[PDB]
Design an enzyme around this catalytic site. Sequence first.
Site, PDB file in Angstrom:
ATOM      1  N   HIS A 120      40.616  37.185  57.877  1.00 48.20           N
ATOM      2  CA  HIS A 120      39.892  36.201  58.509  1.00 48.20           C
ATOM      3  C   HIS A 120      39.082  36.654  59.795  1.00 48.20           C
ATOM      4  O   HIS A 120      40.162  37.318  60.836  1.00 48.20           O
ATOM      5  CB  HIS A 120      40.952  34.907  58.718  1.00 48.20           C
ATOM      6  CG  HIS A 120      40.624  33.604  59.388  1.00 48.20           C
ATOM      7  ND1 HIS A 120      40.064  33.602  60.683  1.00 48.20           N
ATOM      8  CD2 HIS A 120      40.601  32.383  58.779  1.00 48.20           C
ATOM      9  CE1 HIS A 120      39.855  32.428  60.807  1.00 48.20           C
ATOM     10  NE2 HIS A 120      39.938  31.504  59.883  1.00 48.20           N
TER      11      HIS A 120
ATOM     12  N   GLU B  71      44.048  27.508  52.721  1.00 47.12           N
ATOM     13  CA  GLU B  71      44.464  28.825  53.332  1.00 47.12           C
ATOM     14  C   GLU B  71      45.811  29.385  53.430  1.00 47.12           C
ATOM     15  O   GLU B  71      46.133  30.349  53.330  1.00 47.12           O
ATOM     16  CB  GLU B  71      43.601  28.651  54.703  1.00 47.12           C
ATOM     17  CG  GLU B  71      43.547  29.988  55.281  1.00 47.12           C
ATOM     18  CD  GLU B  71      42.438  29.970  56.253  1.00 47.12           C
ATOM     19  OE1 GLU B  71      43.069  29.595  57.522  1.00 47.12           O
ATOM     20  OE2 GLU B  71      41.418  30.478  56.212  1.00 47.12           O
TER      21      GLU B  71
END
Lengths: 297, 297
Positions: free
Chosen positions: B176, B246
């Site tokens: 990320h 996520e």
Amino acid sequence: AIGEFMVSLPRMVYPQPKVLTPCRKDVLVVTPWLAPIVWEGTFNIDILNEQFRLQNTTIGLTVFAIKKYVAFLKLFLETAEKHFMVGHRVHYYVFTDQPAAVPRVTLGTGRQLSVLEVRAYKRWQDVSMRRMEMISDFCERRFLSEVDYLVCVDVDMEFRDHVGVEILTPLFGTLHPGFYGSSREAFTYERRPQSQAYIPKDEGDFYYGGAFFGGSVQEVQRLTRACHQAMMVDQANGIEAVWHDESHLNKYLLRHKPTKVLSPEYLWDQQLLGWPAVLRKLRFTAVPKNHQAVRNP
Amino acid sequence: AIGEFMVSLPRMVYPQPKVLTPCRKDVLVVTPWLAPIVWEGTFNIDILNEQFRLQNTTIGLTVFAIKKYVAFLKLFLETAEKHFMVGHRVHYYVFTDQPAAVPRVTLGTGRQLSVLEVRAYKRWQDVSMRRMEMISDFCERRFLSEVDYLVCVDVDMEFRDHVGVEILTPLFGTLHPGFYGSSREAFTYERRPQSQAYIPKDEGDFYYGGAFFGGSVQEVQRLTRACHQAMMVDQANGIEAVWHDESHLNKYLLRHKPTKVLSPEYLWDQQLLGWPAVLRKLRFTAVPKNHQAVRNP
Ligand SMILES: O=c1ccn([C@@H]2O[C@H](COP(=O)(O)OP(=O)(O)O)[C@@H](O)[C@H]2O)c(=O)[nH]1
Ligand SMILES: O=c1ccn([C@@H]2O[C@H](COP(=O)(O)OP(=O)(O)O)[C@@H](O)[C@H]2O)c(=O)[nH]1
Ligand SMILES: [Mn+2]
Ligand SMILES: [Mn+2]
């Protein structure tokens, strides 16, 4: 087994990986085809041991001890017991023309040894080369049903430090200790186009050592059969590659890239090369020998 | 196909790998479990293209465009045509509640697109989360018989540079862009033990983005089903993980380590983060959006 059973790692506490800090600053740790190059500092053995133990991994280790090379077995096997795949299931396969010469080495739990009798060729080159045929002959005989991975090594060697599941992958070769810093044109590949092992001067990734390769049983079967078949073409054409099985191994791994490459920590000769700063560990090392004496009656 | 057909690379001329020169000095290029971390400079795309083309590889790309997010499709697909897996077989799977809103994008040879109609959940969190169920529902329907690998991405994005076969592996996640330089205690994992996504403060390798993951069909099926089943346990217990799919992806990849990790070149937001020196390329980037407007009627 191989193919990844669905399993979950347990909770583990270990240092966080450092995205913005290279694990080694002095060496290449991944090939251009995204295969790891295995050096100390690249792996957390605790994570890898978990992964491979959860898959109930069995490792076969092949070693040939033909004619006078039976003398190397005791140290080879003793030191393998200290350093090779400890904690995992191991099956040693000792190929020899002298079963009664295999020393009685005490094995740890979960480790076994089989003696496989084979013929002895006169020329040491032929002994070395015919390992490919013999390993390939034993995939169907034993290995496919007994082990997940095969590790295929020279006997004139000793383990000095950890050699574990960090090496395991579908197909691996090992950087030869004489050539890891060399330019490709200095690599001692077979350079005669009339050999199946021929590699032109402008090709080659690495010079891999014939003394340490391996992989899944399937991939080792493919490699060994290909190298044997290539040897037989050469023999029919009256040519023997300059470095024998090693030359054919190098041709195969040029054309079929390994999925890991082992650093020269895994294949070393301290007498000839010392202990450079780039080797943080010396794991699997040559035992001194007199070629002429030990290869001939 | 996957599983490695026996194939040989052709002769290729390219620079020799440099054993004693690190490919990157500024970043980690391999995880502690020996998975490559994919950055520019780590791979020779010509070698990788050969390997994957010889295996006749087909890549599926899943993307969800539900409710107002159909507006993102044209740029997503146009730019995928310029940058995603060019030269390889590609099958796009566009999941939408509005088939008539899928733009007519011109595709290159060997590339096809299927529209899969699905229901639209009210809450954007549910839309995002239910992708796991929907991807898992379509493994048996289509994917196992149609593609070798699946790549599963957000739609509110554009390709700006190469995204190719260097990503392909049994299981991958992507760093990320908000957290690649962060310590694990700053990662926004789910921290409540009453959620199935819970990760304690002393655990975690990386913070992976929900917007870009993938792998073989088998591994993606496993991941997506596990995350869906975990979501359903949470729902029964009256808890929704802090970052939705996520959070569950991160729990899964902690427990089942990926075999490659993609650098933030592959998942970036230039508006929020600029173009740091550590990113040599910006490959797949956020398209600006107003969350409140675009997620609600
Ligand atoms: O008479 C011989 C010659 C060779 N070998 C086997 O073939 C390997 C390769 O030969 P060698 O180690 O002599 O090659 P080098 O390491 O010197 O190149 C040995 O380690 C043994 O396993 C053997 O068993 N007996
Ligand atoms: O109304 C919505 C909300 C979400 N999504 C899908 O879910 C993904 C994740 O949501 P979003 O991109 O809004 O999350 P963010 O990137 O902002 O965290 C989107 O890219 C879309 O593929 C969608 O199609 N419609
Ligand atoms: Mn030797
Ligand atoms: Mn998004």
